[PDB]
């Protein structure tokens with residue numbers, strides 16, 4: 001937790017070079033991907049090794065939303081697309097089972113957090129699609145609040161994304177960054193405002209999206225979006241993540257070093273450099289030695305094994321119900 005930088009590792013086991021870089025104080029987390037996941041035991045061993053190499057507390061995170069975005073599937077309960085809960089007759093009840101189950105099984109495998117939930121509105125943006133909980137404000141709020149309650153219940157920190165709303169985004173040749181040219185995105189942002197005000201988000205990830213009515217920069221590299229709006233207008237007090245600086249970020253600024261500088265000056269607390277070990281190293285060398293003490297809030301609050309978890313009727317039911325829900329609409 002201590003440092004701002006999130007990076008990844010190459011495979012199923014920690015390398016000797018991994019063990020060295022994990023000790024760099026500017027590192028605060030490892031983001032895991034599908035290529036880091038083979039099986040439950042291998043995952044447990046990998047995370048144990050990460051925490052031992054780091055020595056100090058360190059965050060381990062994953063994109064585990066359900067549906068199209070679930071890095072760990074084999075040997076885990078399948079989680080439905082976030083869209084599916086609101087299609088069921090008891091959606092709010094099931095959304096909480098989905099969030100609880102997703103979070104519980106990650107904690108059982110020594111993972112601190114999932115970069116979830118998606119608070120975007122609508123299904124028309126290809127990148128989002130059925131990752132959204134609904135296509136109007138109330139449906140999104142109702143079902144995302146349930147999912148959040150489930151995460152909270154097991155001690156997992158929560159991350160709203162992709163602020164200030166990725167639901168209506170276009171990524172064609174009209175501009176060089178995905179964009180949303182609407183004169184107002186008030187409804188999209190109202191979802192974020194509501195969850196911020198309810199105090200249910202520990203963290204926030206911004207969208208790599210330009211909203212030209214508002215500001216020239218992608219929100220993820222925008223002083224307006226991340227300070228003026230997110231902090232001053234909206235009163236968000238949690239952790240702000242960057243986007244993946246390796247393929248997103250303020251691309252016009254230059255390389256990883258320039259993108260990292262812009263993310264931090266814009267108001268990100270923590271920065272992500274994925275898929276590019278040599279870029280992570282470059283950024284570590286460029287930056288001051290940095291600390292993010294408030295990121296300790298993101299470390300998981302509970303500890304238990306998968307065996308212990310499965311003894312809960314709550315697990316027995318949630319797991320079965322998620323499989324039913326998937327089968328109901330797939």
Ligand SMILES: CC(=O)N[C@@H]1[C@@H](O)[C@H](O)[C@@H](CO)O[C@@H]1O
Pocket residue numbers: 063115127161162166205208243244248272
């Ligand atoms: C629009 C989109 O999918 N953005 C993703 C985000 O959800 C994810 O948490 C992050 C880390 O993998 O990479 C991206 O920025």
